[PDB]
Amino acid sequence: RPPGYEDPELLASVTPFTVEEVEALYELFKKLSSSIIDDGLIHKEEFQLALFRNRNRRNLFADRIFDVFDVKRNGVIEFGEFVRSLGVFHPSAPVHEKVKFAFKLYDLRQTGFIEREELKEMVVALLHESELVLSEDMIEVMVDKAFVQADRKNDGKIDIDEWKDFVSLNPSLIKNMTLPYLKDINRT
């Protein structure tokens, strides 16, 4: 009847998941939150491991993922934070939440905008996801074109509205904002 306890019906009702899926994700949370410390929290040390091990997103953005998973900004990931952040990757999650999440992700230093050098590290990382590794001048041409396309109110930084415009023209930037195995999950 314990501390940290959260009725799975609760998360079920605010996410694309169901009770059984929420209960299921609790098993997976116990795994990741116990690796090193056994306090019911996923320390970032243990987030790394879990992404490193059962590969999901990407190693160099784990500090980025960890950071946005960390909704109540307090240095760790709690169970409900973990389920709600994951729920955003669900195929039925509203595209709004996916666009927003992707935006926090790319705001590399957490400043409320996307600056050119962050669009760059972004584009590089996405390219490399699709096994394309291009010359540095191929890249700043690309990044330059995409950056003036995106920076509508011409002022050197992308805000969430221009991002939304930008992504509507570039829907593949939020390609990975959805993981299709999450529709019915796989016991292990």
Binding region for its own copies (CB under 8 A)? 130-132, 135, 138, 141-142, 145, 172, 175
CB of 158 to its own copies, least distance (A): 20
Q: Does 138 bind Ca ion (CB under 5 A)?
A: no
Residue 67, binding choice from its own copies, Ca ion, none, Cβ under 5 to 8 Å by partner class: none
One of 7, 20, 30, 37 touching Ca ion (CB under 5 A):
37
Torsion (CA) 179, 41, 106, 133 in degrees, nearest 10: -60
All residues at 6 or more sequence positions from 16 whose CB lies less than 8 Å from its CB, including other chains: 87, 90, 91, 92, 93, 182
**Cα–Cα distance, 89 to 107 (Å, whole number):** 18
E strand or H helix at 149, and its extent? helix 136-150
CB of 184 to Ca ion, least distance (A): 28
Q: Does 74 bind Ca ion (CB under 5 A)?
A: yes
Q: Does 111 bind Ca ion (CB under 5 A)?
A: yes
CB 130 within 8 A of CB 58: no
The binding site for Ca ion (CB under 5 A) comprises: 33, 37, 39, 41, 70, 72, 74, 81, 107, 111, 151, 153, 155, 162
